[PDB]
Amino acid sequence: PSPLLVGREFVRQYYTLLNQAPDMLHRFYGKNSSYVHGGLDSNGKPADAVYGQKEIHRKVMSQNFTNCHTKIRHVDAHATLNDGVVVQVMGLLSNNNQALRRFMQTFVLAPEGSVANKFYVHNDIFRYQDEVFG
């Protein structure tokens, strides 16, 4: 299974579903997965990830994604240990029809290994550039 073709198709689905129905995104994730999506804590430090399909859904919900538009600018994917796929993504995101913000992200996909050609998101690191640089 070509990774560049898999990564590129996964990203298609992820950001389509984020636009249409953010409440479903959690279905991409497996029982051990991790997730972040920008944000700073009250000290101004980058937010921590959370873990498990359950918590990831809470935290997605807590983000209030509404009519979320994404302008992809860069996708690169490569086989990784045990047939996985690391995918690296750079783009801009716009939530609630407000302004587009640069982000940098990394996915690790794992085979559902039950089937074939099926994957779930094990890791999802997303940060906005504006919370990290200037």
Partner: peptide, 6 residues
């Protein structure tokens, strides 16, 4: 290809 359970 398939991603998660839908």
């Amino acid at each position: 290809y398939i991603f998660g359970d839908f």
